[PDB]
Amino acid sequence: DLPLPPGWSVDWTMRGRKYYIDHNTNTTHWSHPLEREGLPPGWERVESSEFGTYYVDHTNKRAQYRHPCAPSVPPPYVAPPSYEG
Amino acid sequence: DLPLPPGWSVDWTMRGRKYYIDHNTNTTHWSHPLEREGLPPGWERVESSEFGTYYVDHTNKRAQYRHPCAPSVPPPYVAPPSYEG
Ligand SMILES: [K+]
Ligand SMILES: [K+]
Ligand SMILES: [K+]
Ligand SMILES: [K+]
Ligand SMILES: [K+]
């Protein structure tokens, strides 16, 4: 949907997974560069049918469920307003 | 974007957070009912600018970073194909 910034292109893995090619920096990425609000450089949010939504750190070649910048404690439960309706 | 199933409506919290009202079951929800693929009943995926993406269990009033169905081990690191470009 969102336009690629100048200097990018897209391709596909042998499993059908889209990736983004940055010809400005000669690097490749799982996510659109305009869809990384709140993420530090080197980190991406990824979606998995087996593991759900998690985060990868390309600079350390590791992954974790928690956003890199989230408090290192479990996140807060909040319910929507009760049915009124 | 996606049409609401029959019997639903939408409203807004005093913080500007959208929620979904199910008049079929007299319940309320943070997420669109057609956007919960892979989630068990009672669980939702939520987005937070402070905590990132996590999951809430309305039946236990708790939250966790890991998808309820994800393996209880850290998720796998996978890099996109190296720049060719
Ligand atoms: K450029
Ligand atoms: K281009
Ligand atoms: K997560
Ligand atoms: K109905
Ligand atoms: K309606």
Side-chain angles (χ1 to χ4, degrees), chain B residues 21-77:
Chain B
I21 301 165
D22 183 6
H23 301 280
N24 301 291
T25 58
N26 291 9
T27 58
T28 60
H29 306 268
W30 289 128
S31 64
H32 195 297
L34 297 182
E35 303 182 341
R36 316 207 192 127
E37 282 296 329
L39 284 172
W43 289 77
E44 298 192 286
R45 181 172 133 197
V46 294
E47 310 282 352
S48 172
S49 44
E50 174 169 343
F51 290 93
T53 308
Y54 63 97
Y55 299 85
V56 296
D57 178 356
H58 295 303
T59 78
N60 284 291
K61 297 193 182 180
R62 56 178 300 282
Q64 60 184 50
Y65 292 113
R66 181 181 41 90
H67 190 291
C69 300
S72 300
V73 297
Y77 176 76

Short mmCIF file of all heavy atoms in Angstrom, two decimals, chain B residues 21-77:
data_model
loop_
_atom_site.label_atom_id
_atom_site.label_comp_id
_atom_site.label_asym_id
_atom_site.label_seq_id
_atom_site.Cartn_x
_atom_site.Cartn_y
_atom_site.Cartn_z
N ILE B 21 -18.35 -3.70 19.54
CA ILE B 21 -19.46 -4.09 20.39
C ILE B 21 -20.23 -5.20 19.71
O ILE B 21 -20.74 -5.02 18.60
CB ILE B 21 -20.40 -2.91 20.68
CG1 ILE B 21 -19.63 -1.78 21.37
CG2 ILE B 21 -21.62 -3.38 21.50
CD1 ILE B 21 -20.37 -0.48 21.36
N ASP B 22 -20.28 -6.37 20.35
CA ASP B 22 -20.99 -7.52 19.81
C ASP B 22 -22.36 -7.64 20.44
O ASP B 22 -22.49 -8.16 21.55
CB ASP B 22 -20.19 -8.81 20.07
CG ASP B 22 -20.84 -10.03 19.45
OD1 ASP B 22 -21.85 -9.87 18.72
OD2 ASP B 22 -20.35 -11.17 19.70
N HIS B 23 -23.38 -7.17 19.73
CA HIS B 23 -24.74 -7.24 20.25
C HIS B 23 -25.33 -8.65 20.14
O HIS B 23 -26.45 -8.88 20.58
CB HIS B 23 -25.65 -6.23 19.52
CG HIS B 23 -25.19 -4.80 19.65
ND1 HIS B 23 -25.44 -4.05 20.78
CD2 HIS B 23 -24.49 -4.01 18.81
CE1 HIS B 23 -24.91 -2.85 20.62
NE2 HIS B 23 -24.33 -2.79 19.43
N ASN B 24 -24.58 -9.58 19.55
CA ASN B 24 -25.03 -10.97 19.50
C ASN B 24 -24.79 -11.65 20.84
O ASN B 24 -25.60 -12.45 21.28
CB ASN B 24 -24.31 -11.76 18.40
CG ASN B 24 -24.52 -11.17 17.02
OD1 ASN B 24 -25.62 -11.21 16.48
ND2 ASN B 24 -23.45 -10.66 16.43
N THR B 25 -23.69 -11.29 21.49
CA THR B 25 -23.28 -11.96 22.73
C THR B 25 -23.22 -11.01 23.94
O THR B 25 -22.88 -11.44 25.06
CB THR B 25 -21.90 -12.61 22.58
OG1 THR B 25 -20.95 -11.61 22.21
CG2 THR B 25 -21.93 -13.73 21.52
N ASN B 26 -23.57 -9.74 23.71
CA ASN B 26 -23.45 -8.67 24.71
C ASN B 26 -22.05 -8.60 25.31
O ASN B 26 -21.85 -8.64 26.53
CB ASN B 26 -24.50 -8.86 25.80
CG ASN B 26 -25.91 -8.61 25.30
OD1 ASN B 26 -26.14 -8.46 24.10
ND2 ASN B 26 -26.87 -8.58 26.22
N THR B 27 -21.07 -8.49 24.42
CA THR B 27 -19.68 -8.38 24.82
C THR B 27 -18.99 -7.29 24.02
O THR B 27 -19.52 -6.81 23.01
CB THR B 27 -18.92 -9.70 24.63
OG1 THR B 27 -18.99 -10.10 23.25
CG2 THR B 27 -19.49 -10.80 25.51
N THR B 28 -17.82 -6.89 24.50
CA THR B 28 -17.04 -5.85 23.85
C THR B 28 -15.60 -6.33 23.67
O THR B 28 -15.13 -7.20 24.43
CB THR B 28 -17.05 -4.53 24.65
OG1 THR B 28 -16.50 -4.78 25.94
CG2 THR B 28 -18.46 -3.99 24.81
N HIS B 29 -14.92 -5.76 22.68
CA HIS B 29 -13.65 -6.30 22.18
C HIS B 29 -12.75 -5.20 21.67
O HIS B 29 -13.22 -4.23 21.09
CB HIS B 29 -13.92 -7.29 21.05
CG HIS B 29 -14.87 -8.37 21.43
ND1 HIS B 29 -14.46 -9.58 21.95
CD2 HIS B 29 -16.23 -8.40 21.44
CE1 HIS B 29 -15.52 -10.32 22.23
NE2 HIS B 29 -16.61 -9.62 21.94
N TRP B 30 -11.45 -5.37 21.82
CA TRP B 30 -10.52 -4.40 21.25
C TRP B 30 -10.31 -4.57 19.75
O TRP B 30 -9.96 -3.60 19.05
CB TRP B 30 -9.16 -4.50 21.93
CG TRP B 30 -9.11 -4.00 23.33
CD1 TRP B 30 -8.64 -4.67 24.41
CD2 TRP B 30 -9.51 -2.71 23.80
NE1 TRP B 30 -8.71 -3.87 25.54
CE2 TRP B 30 -9.25 -2.67 25.19
CE3 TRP B 30 -10.07 -1.58 23.19
CZ2 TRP B 30 -9.54 -1.55 25.97
CZ3 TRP B 30 -10.35 -0.47 23.97
CH2 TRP B 30 -10.09 -0.47 25.34
N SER B 31 -10.49 -5.78 19.24
CA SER B 31 -10.13 -6.03 17.85
C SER B 31 -11.35 -6.43 17.01
O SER B 31 -12.36 -6.92 17.51
CB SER B 31 -9.03 -7.10 17.76
OG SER B 31 -9.47 -8.34 18.25
N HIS B 32 -11.24 -6.16 15.73
CA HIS B 32 -12.27 -6.55 14.77
C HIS B 32 -12.43 -8.08 14.75
O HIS B 32 -11.45 -8.80 14.68
CB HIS B 32 -11.86 -6.02 13.40
CG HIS B 32 -12.95 -6.03 12.38
ND1 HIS B 32 -13.56 -7.18 11.95
CD2 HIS B 32 -13.48 -5.02 11.65
CE1 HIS B 32 -14.45 -6.88 11.02
NE2 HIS B 32 -14.42 -5.58 10.81
N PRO B 33 -13.68 -8.58 14.79
CA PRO B 33 -13.85 -10.04 14.86
C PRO B 33 -13.36 -10.80 13.62
O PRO B 33 -13.16 -12.01 13.71
CB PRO B 33 -15.37 -10.22 15.00
CG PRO B 33 -15.95 -8.99 14.46
CD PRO B 33 -14.98 -7.88 14.83
N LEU B 34 -13.15 -10.10 12.51
CA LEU B 34 -12.60 -10.76 11.33
C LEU B 34 -11.09 -10.59 11.26
O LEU B 34 -10.47 -10.94 10.25
CB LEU B 34 -13.25 -10.23 10.05
CG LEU B 34 -14.75 -10.51 9.97
CD1 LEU B 34 -15.27 -9.99 8.64
CD2 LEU B 34 -15.05 -11.99 10.14
N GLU B 35 -10.49 -10.06 12.33
CA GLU B 35 -9.04 -9.89 12.37
C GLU B 35 -8.43 -10.62 13.55
O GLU B 35 -7.52 -10.11 14.21
CB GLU B 35 -8.69 -8.40 12.42
CG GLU B 35 -9.27 -7.62 11.24
CD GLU B 35 -8.89 -6.14 11.22
OE1 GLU B 35 -8.47 -5.60 12.27
OE2 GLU B 35 -9.02 -5.52 10.14
N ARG B 36 -8.93 -11.83 13.83
CA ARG B 36 -8.42 -12.64 14.93
C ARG B 36 -8.02 -14.03 14.49
O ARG B 36 -8.16 -14.99 15.26
CB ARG B 36 -9.46 -12.79 16.03
CG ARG B 36 -10.15 -11.52 16.35
CD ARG B 36 -10.64 -11.50 17.78
NE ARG B 36 -11.54 -10.37 17.94
CZ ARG B 36 -12.78 -10.46 18.42
NH1 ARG B 36 -13.26 -11.63 18.84
NH2 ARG B 36 -13.52 -9.37 18.50
N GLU B 37 -7.53 -14.16 13.27
CA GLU B 37 -7.07 -15.45 12.80
C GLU B 37 -5.95 -15.97 13.68
O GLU B 37 -5.01 -15.24 13.98
CB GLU B 37 -6.60 -15.35 11.34
CG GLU B 37 -7.76 -15.33 10.36
CD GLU B 37 -8.57 -16.62 10.40
OE1 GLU B 37 -7.97 -17.69 10.68
OE2 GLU B 37 -9.79 -16.58 10.15
N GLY B 38 -6.08 -17.21 14.13
CA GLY B 38 -5.05 -17.84 14.92
C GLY B 38 -5.15 -17.60 16.41
O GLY B 38 -4.33 -18.11 17.17
N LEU B 39 -6.15 -16.83 16.84
CA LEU B 39 -6.35 -16.57 18.26
C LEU B 39 -7.50 -17.39 18.82
O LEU B 39 -8.55 -17.48 18.19
CB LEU B 39 -6.60 -15.09 18.53
CG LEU B 39 -5.38 -14.18 18.46
CD1 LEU B 39 -5.81 -12.73 18.54
CD2 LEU B 39 -4.43 -14.51 19.60
N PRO B 40 -7.29 -18.00 19.99
CA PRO B 40 -8.35 -18.72 20.70
C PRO B 40 -9.38 -17.76 21.27
O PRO B 40 -9.05 -16.60 21.51
CB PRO B 40 -7.59 -19.44 21.81
CG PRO B 40 -6.39 -18.58 22.06
CD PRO B 40 -6.01 -18.03 20.72
N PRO B 41 -10.61 -18.24 21.47
CA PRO B 41 -11.66 -17.39 22.02
C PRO B 41 -11.23 -16.78 23.34
O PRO B 41 -10.63 -17.50 24.16
CB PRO B 41 -12.84 -18.35 22.21
CG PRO B 41 -12.56 -19.49 21.30
CD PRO B 41 -11.07 -19.62 21.22
N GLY B 42 -11.53 -15.51 23.55
CA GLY B 42 -11.21 -14.85 24.81
C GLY B 42 -9.89 -14.11 24.76
O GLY B 42 -9.62 -13.29 25.62
N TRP B 43 -9.08 -14.39 23.74
CA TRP B 43 -7.79 -13.70 23.59
C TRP B 43 -7.82 -12.67 22.45
O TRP B 43 -8.47 -12.90 21.42
CB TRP B 43 -6.68 -14.71 23.31
CG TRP B 43 -6.29 -15.59 24.47
CD1 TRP B 43 -6.96 -16.69 24.94
CD2 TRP B 43 -5.09 -15.48 25.25
NE1 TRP B 43 -6.27 -17.24 25.99
CE2 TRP B 43 -5.11 -16.54 26.18
CE3 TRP B 43 -4.00 -14.59 25.25
CZ2 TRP B 43 -4.10 -16.72 27.13
CZ3 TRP B 43 -3.00 -14.78 26.18
CH2 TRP B 43 -3.04 -15.84 27.11
N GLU B 44 -7.11 -11.56 22.63
CA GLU B 44 -6.92 -10.56 21.56
C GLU B 44 -5.48 -10.10 21.44
O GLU B 44 -4.74 -10.07 22.41
CB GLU B 44 -7.82 -9.33 21.80
CG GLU B 44 -9.29 -9.69 21.78
CD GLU B 44 -10.16 -8.47 21.72
OE1 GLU B 44 -10.28 -7.78 22.75
OE2 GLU B 44 -10.69 -8.19 20.63
N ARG B 45 -5.09 -9.73 20.22
CA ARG B 45 -3.81 -9.05 20.01
C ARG B 45 -4.03 -7.55 20.10
O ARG B 45 -4.97 -7.01 19.50
CB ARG B 45 -3.22 -9.43 18.66
CG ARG B 45 -1.88 -8.79 18.36
CD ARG B 45 -1.31 -9.40 17.08
NE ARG B 45 -0.81 -8.41 16.15
CZ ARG B 45 -0.59 -8.65 14.86
NH1 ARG B 45 -0.83 -9.85 14.36
NH2 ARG B 45 -0.12 -7.69 14.07
N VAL B 46 -3.17 -6.87 20.85
CA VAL B 46 -3.28 -5.43 21.04
C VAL B 46 -1.96 -4.77 20.71
O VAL B 46 -0.89 -5.39 20.79
CB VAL B 46 -3.71 -5.07 22.48
CG1 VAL B 46 -5.12 -5.57 22.76
CG2 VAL B 46 -2.74 -5.66 23.49
N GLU B 47 -2.05 -3.50 20.33
CA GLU B 47 -0.89 -2.70 19.98
C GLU B 47 -0.76 -1.58 21.00
O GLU B 47 -1.76 -0.97 21.39
CB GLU B 47 -1.02 -2.13 18.58
CG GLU B 47 -1.40 -3.13 17.51
CD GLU B 47 -0.23 -3.97 17.08
OE1 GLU B 47 0.91 -3.67 17.50
OE2 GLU B 47 -0.45 -4.94 16.32
N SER B 48 0.46 -1.32 21.43
CA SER B 48 0.72 -0.32 22.45
C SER B 48 1.97 0.48 22.07
O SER B 48 2.96 -0.10 21.64
CB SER B 48 0.90 -1.00 23.81
OG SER B 48 1.33 -0.10 24.81
N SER B 49 1.93 1.80 22.21
CA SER B 49 3.13 2.58 21.90
C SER B 49 4.18 2.40 22.99
O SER B 49 5.37 2.60 22.76
CB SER B 49 2.78 4.06 21.71
OG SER B 49 1.89 4.50 22.71
N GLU B 50 3.75 2.00 24.18
CA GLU B 50 4.68 1.78 25.29
C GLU B 50 5.15 0.33 25.36
O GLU B 50 6.33 0.07 25.63
CB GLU B 50 4.05 2.18 26.62
CG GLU B 50 4.92 1.85 27.84
CD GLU B 50 4.42 2.49 29.13
OE1 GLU B 50 3.60 3.43 29.06
OE2 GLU B 50 4.87 2.06 30.22
N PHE B 51 4.24 -0.61 25.12
CA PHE B 51 4.56 -2.03 25.31
C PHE B 51 4.68 -2.83 24.01
O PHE B 51 5.00 -4.02 24.05
CB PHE B 51 3.50 -2.68 26.20
CG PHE B 51 3.57 -2.23 27.63
CD1 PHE B 51 2.80 -1.17 28.07
CD2 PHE B 51 4.44 -2.85 28.52
CE1 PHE B 51 2.88 -0.74 29.39
CE2 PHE B 51 4.52 -2.43 29.84
CZ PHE B 51 3.75 -1.38 30.27
N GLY B 52 4.44 -2.19 22.87
CA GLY B 52 4.50 -2.90 21.60
C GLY B 52 3.31 -3.84 21.43
O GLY B 52 2.23 -3.61 21.99
N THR B 53 3.50 -4.89 20.64
CA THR B 53 2.42 -5.82 20.36
C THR B 53 2.40 -6.91 21.40
O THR B 53 3.40 -7.58 21.64
CB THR B 53 2.56 -6.45 18.97
OG1 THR B 53 2.74 -5.40 18.01
CG2 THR B 53 1.31 -7.24 18.60
N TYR B 54 1.25 -7.09 22.03
CA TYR B 54 1.11 -8.19 22.97
C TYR B 54 -0.29 -8.77 22.94
O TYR B 54 -1.09 -8.44 22.06
CB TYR B 54 1.49 -7.74 24.39
CG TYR B 54 0.65 -6.65 25.06
CD1 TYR B 54 -0.35 -6.98 25.95
CD2 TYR B 54 0.94 -5.30 24.87
CE1 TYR B 54 -1.07 -6.00 26.62
CE2 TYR B 54 0.22 -4.32 25.54
CZ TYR B 54 -0.79 -4.68 26.41
OH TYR B 54 -1.53 -3.72 27.08
N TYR B 55 -0.58 -9.66 23.88
CA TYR B 55 -1.83 -10.40 23.85
C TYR B 55 -2.53 -10.33 25.19
O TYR B 55 -1.88 -10.41 26.23
CB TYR B 55 -1.55 -11.87 23.48
CG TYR B 55 -0.94 -12.01 22.11
CD1 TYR B 55 0.44 -11.90 21.94
CD2 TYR B 55 -1.73 -12.18 20.99
CE1 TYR B 55 1.01 -11.99 20.70
CE2 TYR B 55 -1.16 -12.29 19.73
CZ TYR B 55 0.21 -12.18 19.59
OH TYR B 55 0.76 -12.28 18.34
N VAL B 56 -3.84 -10.14 25.16
CA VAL B 56 -4.62 -10.11 26.39
C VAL B 56 -5.56 -11.31 26.44
O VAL B 56 -6.12 -11.73 25.43
CB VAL B 56 -5.41 -8.80 26.55
CG1 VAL B 56 -4.45 -7.62 26.67
CG2 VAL B 56 -6.40 -8.58 25.38
N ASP B 57 -5.69 -11.87 27.64
CA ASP B 57 -6.62 -12.98 27.92
C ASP B 57 -7.74 -12.41 28.78
O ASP B 57 -7.55 -12.23 29.98
CB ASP B 57 -5.90 -14.12 28.65
CG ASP B 57 -6.83 -15.28 29.02
OD1 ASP B 57 -8.05 -15.18 28.79
OD2 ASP B 57 -6.34 -16.29 29.56
N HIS B 58 -8.88 -12.12 28.16
CA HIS B 58 -10.01 -11.54 28.88
C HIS B 58 -10.61 -12.51 29.89
O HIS B 58 -11.29 -12.08 30.82
CB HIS B 58 -11.09 -11.10 27.89
CG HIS B 58 -10.68 -9.99 26.98
ND1 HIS B 58 -10.22 -8.77 27.44
CD2 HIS B 58 -10.68 -9.91 25.63
CE1 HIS B 58 -9.95 -7.99 26.41
NE2 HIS B 58 -10.21 -8.66 25.30
N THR B 59 -10.37 -13.81 29.71
CA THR B 59 -10.98 -14.78 30.62
C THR B 59 -10.20 -14.93 31.93
O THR B 59 -10.71 -15.48 32.90
CB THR B 59 -11.11 -16.18 29.98
OG1 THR B 59 -9.83 -16.85 29.99
CG2 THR B 59 -11.65 -16.09 28.56
N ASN B 60 -8.96 -14.43 31.95
CA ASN B 60 -8.13 -14.45 33.15
C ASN B 60 -7.67 -13.05 33.56
O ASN B 60 -6.97 -12.89 34.58
CB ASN B 60 -6.92 -15.36 32.96
CG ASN B 60 -7.26 -16.83 33.04
OD1 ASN B 60 -7.61 -17.34 34.11
ND2 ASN B 60 -7.14 -17.54 31.92
N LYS B 61 -8.08 -12.05 32.78
CA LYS B 61 -7.70 -10.65 32.99
C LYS B 61 -6.19 -10.53 33.18
O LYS B 61 -5.70 -9.98 34.17
CB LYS B 61 -8.46 -10.05 34.18
CG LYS B 61 -9.96 -10.03 33.93
CD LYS B 61 -10.69 -9.16 34.95
CE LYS B 61 -12.20 -9.20 34.72
NZ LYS B 61 -12.94 -8.36 35.70
N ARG B 62 -5.45 -11.06 32.21
CA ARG B 62 -4.00 -10.95 32.20
C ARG B 62 -3.48 -10.73 30.78
O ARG B 62 -4.23 -10.84 29.81
CB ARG B 62 -3.35 -12.18 32.83
CG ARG B 62 -3.76 -13.51 32.19
CD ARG B 62 -3.03 -14.69 32.82
NE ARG B 62 -1.58 -14.58 32.69
CZ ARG B 62 -0.91 -14.85 31.57
NH1 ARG B 62 -1.57 -15.25 30.48
NH2 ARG B 62 0.40 -14.69 31.52
N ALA B 63 -2.19 -10.42 30.69
CA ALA B 63 -1.57 -10.12 29.40
C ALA B 63 -0.18 -10.72 29.34
O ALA B 63 0.45 -10.97 30.39
CB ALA B 63 -1.50 -8.61 29.19
N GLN B 64 0.30 -10.97 28.12
CA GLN B 64 1.63 -11.51 27.92
C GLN B 64 2.13 -11.14 26.53
O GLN B 64 1.34 -10.89 25.63
CB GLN B 64 1.62 -13.03 28.09
CG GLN B 64 0.71 -13.76 27.12
CD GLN B 64 0.66 -15.26 27.39
OE1 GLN B 64 0.44 -15.69 28.52
NE2 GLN B 64 0.86 -16.05 26.34
N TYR B 65 3.45 -11.11 26.36
CA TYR B 65 4.01 -10.72 25.07
C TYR B 65 3.86 -11.79 24.01
O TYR B 65 3.78 -11.49 22.82
CB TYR B 65 5.48 -10.37 25.21
CG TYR B 65 5.71 -9.11 26.01
CD1 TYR B 65 6.35 -9.16 27.24
CD2 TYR B 65 5.31 -7.88 25.51
CE1 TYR B 65 6.57 -8.01 27.97
CE2 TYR B 65 5.54 -6.73 26.23
CZ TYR B 65 6.16 -6.80 27.45
OH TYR B 65 6.37 -5.63 28.15
N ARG B 66 3.84 -13.04 24.46
CA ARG B 66 3.83 -14.21 23.58
C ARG B 66 2.41 -14.59 23.18
O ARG B 66 1.52 -14.64 24.02
CB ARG B 66 4.52 -15.39 24.27
CG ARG B 66 4.59 -16.67 23.45
CD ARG B 66 5.28 -17.79 24.26
NE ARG B 66 4.84 -17.77 25.65
CZ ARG B 66 3.79 -18.45 26.11
NH1 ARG B 66 3.06 -19.20 25.29
NH2 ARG B 66 3.47 -18.37 27.40
N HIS B 67 2.22 -14.88 21.90
CA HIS B 67 0.96 -15.42 21.42
C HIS B 67 0.58 -16.62 22.28
O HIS B 67 1.43 -17.44 22.61
CB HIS B 67 1.10 -15.80 19.95
CG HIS B 67 -0.18 -16.15 19.27
ND1 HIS B 67 -0.89 -17.29 19.57
CD2 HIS B 67 -0.85 -15.54 18.27
CE1 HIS B 67 -1.96 -17.36 18.79
NE2 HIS B 67 -1.96 -16.31 17.99
N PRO B 68 -0.71 -16.72 22.67
CA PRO B 68 -1.11 -17.80 23.59
C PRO B 68 -0.73 -19.17 23.05
O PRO B 68 -0.43 -20.06 23.84
CB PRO B 68 -2.64 -17.65 23.67
CG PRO B 68 -3.00 -16.78 22.48
CD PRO B 68 -1.84 -15.87 22.29
N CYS B 69 -0.71 -19.33 21.72
CA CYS B 69 -0.47 -20.64 21.13
C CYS B 69 0.98 -20.86 20.72
O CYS B 69 1.34 -21.96 20.31
CB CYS B 69 -1.39 -20.85 19.94
SG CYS B 69 -3.14 -20.75 20.40
N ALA B 70 1.81 -19.83 20.84
CA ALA B 70 3.22 -19.97 20.49
C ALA B 70 3.95 -20.90 21.46
O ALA B 70 3.63 -20.92 22.65
CB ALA B 70 3.91 -18.61 20.47
N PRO B 71 4.92 -21.67 20.96
CA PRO B 71 5.79 -22.48 21.82
C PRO B 71 6.32 -21.64 22.98
O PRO B 71 6.71 -20.50 22.77
CB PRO B 71 6.92 -22.91 20.89
CG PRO B 71 6.28 -22.96 19.55
CD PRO B 71 5.25 -21.85 19.53
N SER B 72 6.33 -22.21 24.18
CA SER B 72 6.80 -21.50 25.36
C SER B 72 8.33 -21.44 25.39
O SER B 72 8.95 -21.68 26.43
CB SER B 72 6.27 -22.16 26.63
OG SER B 72 4.85 -22.17 26.66
N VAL B 73 8.92 -21.11 24.25
CA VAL B 73 10.36 -20.88 24.14
C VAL B 73 10.52 -19.63 23.29
O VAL B 73 9.59 -19.28 22.56
CB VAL B 73 11.10 -22.07 23.49
CG1 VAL B 73 10.97 -23.32 24.34
CG2 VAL B 73 10.60 -22.31 22.07
N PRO B 74 11.67 -18.94 23.38
CA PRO B 74 11.87 -17.78 22.51
C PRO B 74 11.74 -18.14 21.03
O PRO B 74 12.09 -19.26 20.63
CB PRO B 74 13.30 -17.33 22.84
CG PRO B 74 13.52 -17.82 24.25
CD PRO B 74 12.77 -19.12 24.34
N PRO B 75 11.23 -17.20 20.23
CA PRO B 75 10.96 -17.40 18.81
C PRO B 75 12.24 -17.40 17.99
O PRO B 75 13.26 -16.92 18.47
CB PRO B 75 10.08 -16.21 18.47
CG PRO B 75 10.55 -15.14 19.38
CD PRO B 75 10.90 -15.83 20.66
N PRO B 76 12.19 -17.93 16.75
CA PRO B 76 13.40 -18.13 15.94
C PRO B 76 13.84 -16.90 15.14
O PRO B 76 13.02 -16.19 14.54
CB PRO B 76 12.97 -19.24 14.97
CG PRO B 76 11.51 -18.99 14.78
CD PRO B 76 11.00 -18.50 16.11
N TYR B 77 15.15 -16.66 15.13
CA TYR B 77 15.71 -15.62 14.28
C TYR B 77 15.88 -16.14 12.86
O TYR B 77 16.53 -17.16 12.64
CB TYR B 77 17.06 -15.11 14.80
CG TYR B 77 17.63 -14.11 13.83
CD1 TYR B 77 17.13 -12.82 13.76
CD2 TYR B 77 18.63 -14.48 12.92
CE1 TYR B 77 17.62 -11.91 12.84
CE2 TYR B 77 19.12 -13.57 11.99
CZ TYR B 77 18.62 -12.29 11.96
OH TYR B 77 19.10 -11.38 11.04
#
